[PDB]
Amino acid sequence: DAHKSEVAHRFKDLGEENFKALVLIAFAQYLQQCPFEDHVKLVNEVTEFAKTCVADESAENCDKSLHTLFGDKLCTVATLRETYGEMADCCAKQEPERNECFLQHKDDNPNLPRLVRPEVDVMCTAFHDNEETFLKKYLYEIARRHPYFYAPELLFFAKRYKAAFTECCQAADKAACLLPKLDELRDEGKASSAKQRLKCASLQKFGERAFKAWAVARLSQRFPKAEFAEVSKLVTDLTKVHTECCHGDLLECADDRADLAKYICENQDSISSKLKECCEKPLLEKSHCIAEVENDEMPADLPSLAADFVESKDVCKNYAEAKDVFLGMFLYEYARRHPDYSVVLLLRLAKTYETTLEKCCAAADPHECYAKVFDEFKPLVEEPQNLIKQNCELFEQLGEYKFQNALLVRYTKKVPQVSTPTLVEVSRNLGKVGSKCCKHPEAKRMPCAEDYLSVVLNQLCVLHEKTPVSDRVTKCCTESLVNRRPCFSALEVDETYVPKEFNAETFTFHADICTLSEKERQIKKQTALVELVKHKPKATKEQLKAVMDDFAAFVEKCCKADDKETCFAEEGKKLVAASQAALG
Ligand SMILES: CCCCCCCCCCCCCC(=O)O
Ligand SMILES: CCCCCCCCCCCCCC(=O)O
Ligand SMILES: CCCCCCCCCCCCCC(=O)O
Numbered sequence: 001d002a003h004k005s006e007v008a009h010r011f012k013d014l015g016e017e018n019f020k021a022l023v024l025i026a027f028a029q030y031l032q033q034c035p036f037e038d039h040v041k042l043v044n045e046v047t048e049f050a051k052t053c054v055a056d057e058s059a060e061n062c063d064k065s066l067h068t069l070f071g072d073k074l075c076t077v078a079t080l081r082e083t084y085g086e087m088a089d090c091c092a093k094q095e096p097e098r099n100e101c102f103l104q105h106k107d108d109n110p111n112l113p114r115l116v117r118p119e120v121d122v123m124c125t126a127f128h129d130n131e132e133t134f135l136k137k138y139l140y141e142i143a144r145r146h147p148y149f150y151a152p153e154l155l156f157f158a159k160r161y162k163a164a165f166t167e168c169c170q171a172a173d174k175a176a177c178l179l180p181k182l183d184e185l186r187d188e189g190k191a192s193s194a195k196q197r198l199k200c201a202s203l204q205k206f207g208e209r210a211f212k213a214w215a216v217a218r219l220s221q222r223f224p225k226a227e228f229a230e231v232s233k234l235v236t237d238l239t240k241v242h243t244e245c246c247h248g249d250l251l252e253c254a255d256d257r258a259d260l261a262k263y264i265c266e267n268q269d270s271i272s273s274k275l276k277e278c279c280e281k282p283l284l285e286k287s288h289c290i291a292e293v294e295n296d297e298m299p300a301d302l303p304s305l306a307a308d309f310v311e312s313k314d315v316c317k318n319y320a321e322a323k324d325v326f327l328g329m330f331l332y333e334y335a336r337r338h339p340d341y342s343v344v345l346l347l348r349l350a351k352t353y354e355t356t357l358e359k360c361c362a363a364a365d366p367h368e369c370y371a372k373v374f375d376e377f378k379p380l381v382e383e384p385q386n387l388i389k390q391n392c393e394l395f396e397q398l399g400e401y402k403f404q405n406a407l408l409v410r411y412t413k414k415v416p417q418v419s420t421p422t423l424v425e426v427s428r429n430l431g432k433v434g435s436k437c438c439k440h441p442e443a444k445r446m447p448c449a450e451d452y453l454s455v456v457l458n459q460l461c462v463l464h465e466k467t468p469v470s471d472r473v474t475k476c477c478t479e480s481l482v483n484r485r486p487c488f489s490a491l492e493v494d495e496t497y498v499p500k501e502f503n504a505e506t507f508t509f510h511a512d513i514c515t516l517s518e519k520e521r522q523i524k525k526q527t528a529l530v531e532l533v534k535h536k537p538k539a540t541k542e543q544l545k546a547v548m549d550d551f552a553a554f555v556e557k558c559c560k561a562d563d564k565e566t567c568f569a570e571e572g573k574k575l576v577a578a579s580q581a582a583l584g
């Protein structure tokens with residue numbers, strides 16, 4: 001509907017709850033150093049003003065744009081120059097430039113102390129006694145630490161956090177219930193943040209064409225019944241939405257997503273049969289629902305790709321008159337028939353086909369030259385499939401924890417220069433990827449692995465390039481995204497590496513380990529295993545196994561011993577000397 005007041009407009013569309021939550025997020029992301037109660041006050045002022053406008057749109061300042069009003073509120077902050085320095089100078093600018101000014105002065109890494117997780121009982125009491133304040137303080141705390149995380153997506157995590165507390169605080173064992181859930185949500189939060197940045201970094205580092213190629217592949221998988229023309233229309237729209245979201249303006253990004261959501265829901269008949277329930281959903285949820293929609297089933301009578309792309313005599317002619325449209329159609333056709341492939345695999349095939357057409361269409365006899373291009377696809381398809389069966393079989397033999405340890409040893413041996421915390425975190429996450437994706441049937445394993453492997457390898461690459469230690473990791477991280485995982489898969493053992501000198505404190509343990517959680521204990525042991533491998537990198541899988549066995553016995557025994565701490569000391573020096581002798 002037409003509206004005199006934009007803020008009254010947004011308010012009625014979102015509802016009061018979502019509005020108040022998003023305003024809090026927006027303020028926390030722009031003013032990261034201001035305390036909670038000042039933010040609560042601002043939220044309440046903006047919210048009370050919104051409701052003035054809902055009641056009377058002819059009221060003072062209700063006609064103003066939400067950008068103008070938002071900037072106006074920031075500029076009423078007293079300590080703005082004293083706290084944010086030159087951000088105060090934004091206030092001397094007219095509104096087109098002012099929001100741009102403010103947006104540039106967001107601090108990606110604010111110097112804020114790590115957010116500590118309270119005990120389960122204190123959280124549950126806080127949740128019980130003061131639900132609104134509990135949940136909003138933390139929304140504030142997370143938003144100010146993540147100024148670029150898309151606010152509506154953060155709102156969606158907050159609701160799952162709320163759900164976890166509702167269930168687990170009434171449980172018999174609260175901590176056994178709650179802490180796994182909070183660990184999952186944190187992982188998904190770190191993953192969502194990873195993807196968002198990775199989209200923008202891909203788009204800038206590699207450009208639209210490659211971005212669109214990725215999108216063609218994925219949308220053809222999701223929507224195999226759609227005609228190429230429609231897919232291409234969605235890709236073009238999807239590419240522009242990303243472009244404007246990567247600039248970081250919330251309203252712009254939200255409006256764009258909701259336009260694309262609106263388009264897709266009006267054209268369900270031309271896109272997918274799986275959009276129905278998504279398209280009934282309210283504003284913020286609809287775009288989010290559509291992003292996570294499941295693959296539609298493929299049409300029945302699908303011709304072979306050979307006809308248009310190998311056997312036609314007009315392959316070169318059709319290619320030459322529009323190369324990207326032709327390659328787009330190739331990718332569209334291949335992808336829609338193969339939801340079981342990774343997008344990157346599909347892009348490798350499309351790039352192979354491109355390379356082949358480029359040379360073969362310049363040969364005296366093209367039709368001959370390019371007649372067996374589909375043979376080049378066999379190894380490309382094989383390579384990821386092999387690793388899947390190979391890792392998921394090993395996962396089934398060992399279980400998550402020991403699978404993780406198998407990885408620790410493998411990757412420490414390959415890149416021993418990486419810091420111990422990084423190797424532990426990456427190997428654990430890689431372990432979970434196996435734990436999650438290996439449970440799927442074959443058809444679903446490769447897309448699963450690609451998605452989760454993408455965020456884990458992003459997190460590694462992000463960590464690494466802030467503190468570089470290995471050129472080989474650098475090369476894998478700075479390569480094309482299509483080649484990133486194969487580059488990492490190709491890393492060999494570093495036979496050059498000179499062992500880390502012995503540090504007795506690293507391999508001394510204490511009685512505290514017995515009472516720690518399964519998670520925390522595993523981490524202390526995994527830390528030690530990395531260091532063991534770094535100190536003895538020529539140790540055989542079987543030699544380490546013997547040390548790992550003796551260590552298990554050491555823990556088990558000293559955790560039943562009366563005097564725990566002298567056990568750990570006395571037996572500990574024994575295990576260490578024996579191990580040193582063993583691994584010589
Ligand atoms: C989107 C966030 C909304 C509210 C979140 C409430 C959760 C608070 C408990 C976790 C605090 C420490 C962070 C963590 O390790 O999980
Ligand atoms: C520890 C806070 C977890 C909150 C999860 C919601 C999404 C926020 C983005 C990523 C949060 C954790 C990032 C970090 O470890 O610094
Ligand atoms: C290039 C600066 C504007 C950033 C645009 C925001 C959208 C991307 C969200 C990424 C959040 C993670 C933070 C980071 O990795 O820098």
Ligand SMILES: CCCCCCCCCCCCCC(=O)O
Nearest residue numbers: 195198199202211214215451454
């Ligand atoms: C709604 C987003 C779908 C279209 C994605 C655009 C192409 C960018 C691909 C590069 C980033 C990969 C991250 C991921 O696996 O999600």
Ligand SMILES: CCCCCCCCCCCCCC(=O)O
Nearest residue numbers: 210212213324327328347350351
């Ligand atoms: C950086 C490599 C990205 C993948 C390259 C695949 C090449 C074949 C696809 C050509 C681009 C199609 C773009 C489109 O029409 O949407």
Ligand SMILES: CCCCCCCCCCCCCC(=O)O
Nearest residue numbers: 010022023026070249250251254
């Ligand atoms: C884009 C810069 C200013 C953003 C903050 C404006 C103040 C209201 C925020 C909440 C309402 C809009 C949220 C949305 O539609 O996604």
Ligand SMILES: CCCCCCCCCCCCCC(=O)O
Nearest residue numbers: 150153196241245257287290291
């Ligand atoms: C696979 C179907 C595509 C439809 C998704 C529409 C939403 C556009 C994505 C824009 C990304 C903004 C950042 C984010 O929400 O993570």
Ligand SMILES: CCCCCCCCCCCCCC(=O)O
Nearest residue numbers: 342384387391430434449450485
């Ligand atoms: C580290 C164990 C993860 C569990 C699954 C193994 C993944 C191996 C295949 C990787 C495929 C990703 C997509 C691709 O590069 O084509």
Ligand SMILES: CCCCCCCCCCCCCC(=O)O
Nearest residue numbers: 387411415418423426485488489
């Ligand atoms: C510091 C750790 C770097 C090494 C870990 C990255 C490698 C994981 C990607 C591939 C995992 C499944 C297939 C494979 O292991 O080749």
Ligand SMILES: CCCCCCCCCCCCCC(=O)O
Nearest residue numbers: 507525528529548551576579580
């Ligand atoms: C050569 C230096 C002395 C080594 C002392 C033993 C430390 C290695 C134990 C860590 C691995 C145990 C993990 C497990 O399988 O539970």
Ligand SMILES: [Co+2]
Nearest residue numbers: 001002003009
């Ligand atoms: Co309207």
Ligand SMILES: [Co+2]
Nearest residue numbers: 127128129130
């Ligand atoms: Co009660």
Ligand SMILES: [Co+2]
Nearest residue numbers: 240244252256
């Ligand atoms: Co625009």
Ligand SMILES: [Co+2]
Nearest residue numbers: 470471472473
């Ligand atoms: Co080198």
